[PDB]
């Protein structure tokens, strides 16, 4: 379980206790007990052996955080070095935002499947987060072309800010 | 080798290409200005030579 509930929330399961009002045996319970004893125990033993071997030959890998280079806004046009660094960090942030959108979509699908018949009521916050992140994504990356760039994103943001400022005049 | 090698190599390549483009535009402007008014080393069209003018006194004084 590398994943954490902070980024992939899951409500605690509330399963009811059995109430076997009938006298018949339960083939589901018998098959689950036999399935555990026959399949789950050897698989658990194999995985424990594998994990013991991994703990013997344990190694590590890291994350490689990048630091913020100067952006496209604060250096002169025609300077290909600053433009290159700003373009690379913008493409990096673009890919990160793609995966943020993927995380929100996974969260929404998990909410819908977990709630089932009550998805129209108790998935309100998941749908609200999905709508807000969709609106922000549409504000920053939507109309950019197949040659999307930091310069094009900046031009779109400046046009949107100009329209909002003009609307705020009246 | 890692991402930093390709990153810095791309930066060096971009610097070389940008300087070459700047120099090509400068060469075009310099050539245009020189041919418009020849005052630099280039487009120096010839002229009859001084060293074959006879400066000796002539048979006629009015020369």
Coordinates of C-alpha atoms in Angstrom, one line a residue:
Chain A
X1 CA 0.0 0.0 0.0
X2 CA 2.2 2.8 -1.3
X3 CA -0.9 4.9 -1.8
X4 CA -2.2 7.1 1.1
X5 CA -5.7 8.1 1.9
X6 CA -4.7 11.8 1.8
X7 CA -4.5 11.7 -2.0
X8 CA -6.8 8.7 -2.6
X9 CA -9.6 9.0 0.0
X10 CA -11.7 6.0 0.8
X11 CA -14.4 6.0 3.5
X12 CA -14.2 3.2 6.1
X13 CA -16.2 0.1 5.1
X14 CA -19.2 -0.6 7.3
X15 CA -20.2 -4.2 6.7
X16 CA -23.1 -5.7 8.7
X17 CA -22.7 -8.8 10.8
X18 CA -24.3 -11.9 9.4
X19 CA -27.7 -13.0 10.7
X20 CA -28.2 -16.6 9.5
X21 CA -31.9 -17.0 10.2
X22 CA -32.1 -20.1 8.1
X23 CA -30.8 -23.6 9.0
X24 CA -29.1 -24.2 5.7
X25 CA -25.3 -24.1 5.5
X26 CA -23.7 -21.3 3.6
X27 CA -21.8 -22.5 0.5
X28 CA -20.2 -19.1 0.2
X29 CA -18.7 -19.3 3.7
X30 CA -17.5 -22.9 3.1
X31 CA -16.0 -22.0 -0.3
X32 CA -14.2 -18.9 1.2
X33 CA -12.8 -20.9 4.1
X34 CA -11.6 -23.6 1.7
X35 CA -10.3 -21.0 -0.8
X36 CA -8.3 -19.4 2.0
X37 CA -6.8 -22.6 3.2
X38 CA -5.9 -23.9 -0.3
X39 CA -5.0 -20.8 -2.3
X40 CA -4.4 -17.8 0.1
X41 CA -1.9 -19.5 2.4
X42 CA 0.6 -20.7 -0.2
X43 CA 0.4 -17.4 -2.1
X44 CA 1.0 -15.6 1.2
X45 CA 4.0 -17.9 1.9
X46 CA 5.5 -17.2 -1.5
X47 CA 5.0 -13.5 -1.2
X48 CA 6.6 -13.5 2.3
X49 CA 9.6 -15.4 0.9
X50 CA 9.9 -12.9 -2.0
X51 CA 9.7 -10.0 0.5
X52 CA 12.4 -11.6 2.7
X53 CA 14.6 -11.7 -0.4
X54 CA 13.8 -8.1 -1.2
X55 CA 14.6 -7.1 2.4
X56 CA 17.9 -8.9 2.0
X57 CA 18.7 -7.1 -1.2
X58 CA 17.1 -3.8 -0.3
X59 CA 17.8 -0.7 -2.4
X60 CA 16.4 2.8 -2.8
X61 CA 15.2 5.3 -5.4
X62 CA 14.4 9.0 -5.1
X63 CA 12.0 11.6 -6.6
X64 CA 14.2 14.2 -8.4
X65 CA 12.4 17.5 -7.5
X66 CA 13.2 20.3 -9.9
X67 CA 13.6 23.8 -8.7
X68 CA 11.9 26.8 -10.3
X69 CA 13.8 28.4 -13.2
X70 CA 13.0 32.0 -14.2
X71 CA 9.7 31.9 -16.1
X72 CA 8.7 33.2 -19.5
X73 CA 7.4 36.5 -18.0
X74 CA 10.6 37.8 -16.5
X75 CA 13.1 37.6 -19.3
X76 CA 13.5 39.3 -22.7
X77 CA 12.1 38.0 -25.9
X78 CA 14.5 36.4 -28.4
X79 CA 16.7 35.0 -25.6
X80 CA 16.5 31.3 -26.5
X81 CA 18.1 30.2 -23.2
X82 CA 15.5 31.7 -20.9
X83 CA 12.8 30.7 -23.4
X84 CA 14.1 27.1 -23.5
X85 CA 14.2 26.9 -19.7
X86 CA 10.7 28.4 -19.3
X87 CA 9.3 26.2 -22.0
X88 CA 10.7 23.1 -20.3
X89 CA 9.4 24.0 -16.9
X90 CA 6.0 24.8 -18.5
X91 CA 5.9 21.4 -20.2
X92 CA 6.8 19.9 -16.9
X93 CA 3.9 21.7 -15.1
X94 CA 1.6 20.8 -18.0
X95 CA 2.3 17.1 -17.5
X96 CA 1.9 17.4 -13.8
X97 CA -1.5 19.1 -14.3
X98 CA -2.5 16.3 -16.6
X99 CA -1.8 13.8 -13.9
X100 CA -3.7 16.0 -11.3
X101 CA -6.7 15.9 -13.6
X102 CA -6.2 12.1 -13.8
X103 CA -6.2 11.9 -10.0
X104 CA -9.4 13.8 -9.8
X105 CA -11.1 11.6 -12.4
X106 CA -10.0 8.5 -10.6
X107 CA -11.4 9.9 -7.3
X108 CA -14.7 10.7 -9.1
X109 CA -15.0 7.2 -10.5
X110 CA -14.2 5.6 -7.2
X111 CA -16.9 7.8 -5.5
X112 CA -19.5 6.7 -8.1
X113 CA -18.7 3.0 -7.8
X114 CA -18.5 3.1 -4.0
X115 CA -21.8 4.9 -3.5
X116 CA -23.7 3.0 -6.3
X117 CA -27.3 4.0 -6.2
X118 CA -26.6 7.1 -4.0
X119 CA -24.1 8.7 -6.4
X120 CA -26.4 11.6 -7.2
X121 CA -26.4 12.7 -3.5
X122 CA -23.2 11.9 -1.6
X123 CA -20.7 12.4 -4.4
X124 CA -21.4 16.1 -4.2
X125 CA -17.9 17.1 -3.1
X126 CA -16.2 14.8 -5.6
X127 CA -18.3 16.2 -8.4
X128 CA -17.7 19.8 -7.2
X129 CA -13.9 19.2 -7.1
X130 CA -14.1 17.7 -10.6
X131 CA -16.0 20.7 -11.9
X132 CA -13.7 23.2 -10.3
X133 CA -10.5 21.5 -11.6
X134 CA -12.2 21.1 -15.0
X135 CA -12.9 24.9 -15.1
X136 CA -9.3 25.7 -14.1
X137 CA -7.9 23.4 -16.7
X138 CA -10.2 24.9 -19.4
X139 CA -9.0 28.4 -18.3
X140 CA -5.4 27.5 -18.6
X141 CA -4.8 24.8 -21.3
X142 CA -8.0 24.4 -23.4
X143 CA -7.8 26.5 -26.5
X144 CA -4.0 26.1 -26.9
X145 CA -3.1 24.3 -30.1
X146 CA -1.2 21.1 -30.8
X147 CA 1.8 23.4 -30.6
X148 CA 0.9 24.5 -27.1
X149 CA 3.6 26.5 -25.4
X150 CA 4.3 28.8 -22.5
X151 CA 4.0 31.8 -24.8
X152 CA 0.6 30.6 -26.1
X153 CA -0.6 30.0 -22.5
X154 CA 0.6 33.4 -21.5
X155 CA -1.2 35.0 -24.5
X156 CA -4.4 33.2 -23.6
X157 CA -4.1 34.3 -19.9
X158 CA -3.4 37.9 -20.9
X159 CA -6.4 38.0 -23.2
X160 CA -8.6 36.5 -20.5
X161 CA -7.3 39.0 -17.9
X162 CA -8.0 41.9 -20.4
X163 CA -11.6 40.7 -20.9
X164 CA -12.1 40.4 -17.2
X165 CA -10.7 43.8 -16.6
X166 CA -12.9 45.3 -19.3
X167 CA -15.9 43.6 -17.8
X168 CA -14.9 45.0 -14.4
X169 CA -15.0 48.5 -15.7
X170 CA -18.8 48.3 -15.9
Chain B
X1 CA 24.4 9.8 -18.5
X2 CA 21.3 11.6 -17.3
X3 CA 19.0 14.5 -18.2
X4 CA 21.4 17.3 -17.3
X5 CA 23.8 16.4 -20.1
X6 CA 21.2 16.6 -22.8
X7 CA 19.8 19.8 -21.1
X8 CA 23.1 21.6 -21.2
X9 CA 24.0 20.4 -24.7
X10 CA 20.7 21.7 -25.9
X11 CA 21.4 25.1 -24.3
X12 CA 24.8 25.2 -26.0
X13 CA 23.4 24.3 -29.3
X14 CA 20.7 27.0 -29.0
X15 CA 23.3 29.6 -28.1
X16 CA 25.4 28.7 -31.1
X17 CA 22.4 28.8 -33.5
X18 CA 21.1 32.1 -32.0
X19 CA 24.5 33.7 -32.4
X20 CA 24.7 32.4 -36.0
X21 CA 21.3 33.9 -36.8
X22 CA 22.3 37.2 -35.3
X23 CA 25.5 37.3 -37.4
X24 CA 23.7 36.4 -40.6
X25 CA 21.2 39.3 -40.1
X26 CA 24.2 41.6 -39.3
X27 CA 26.0 40.4 -42.5
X28 CA 22.9 41.2 -44.6
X29 CA 22.5 44.7 -43.1
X30 CA 26.3 45.4 -43.5
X31 CA 26.3 44.3 -47.1
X32 CA 23.3 46.4 -47.9
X33 CA 24.7 49.5 -46.3
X34 CA 28.1 49.1 -47.9
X35 CA 26.6 48.6 -51.4
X36 CA 24.2 51.5 -50.9
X37 CA 27.2 53.8 -49.9
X38 CA 30.6 52.2 -50.5
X39 CA 32.6 53.2 -47.5
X40 CA 33.8 50.0 -46.0
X41 CA 36.2 47.3 -47.5
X42 CA 33.5 45.7 -49.7
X43 CA 32.0 46.8 -53.0
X44 CA 35.1 49.0 -53.8
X45 CA 34.7 49.5 -57.5
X46 CA 37.9 50.5 -59.3
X47 CA 39.1 53.8 -60.6
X48 CA 41.9 54.9 -63.0
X49 CA 45.3 54.8 -61.4
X50 CA 47.2 57.8 -60.1
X51 CA 50.6 56.3 -60.9
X52 CA 50.2 56.6 -64.7
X53 CA 49.5 60.3 -64.8
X54 CA 52.4 62.2 -66.4
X55 CA 53.3 65.1 -64.0
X56 CA 56.4 66.2 -66.0
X57 CA 56.4 69.7 -67.6
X58 CA 54.8 69.6 -71.0
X59 CA 55.5 71.3 -74.3
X60 CA 52.6 73.6 -73.7
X61 CA 52.6 75.6 -70.4
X62 CA 48.8 75.5 -70.0
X63 CA 48.5 72.0 -68.5

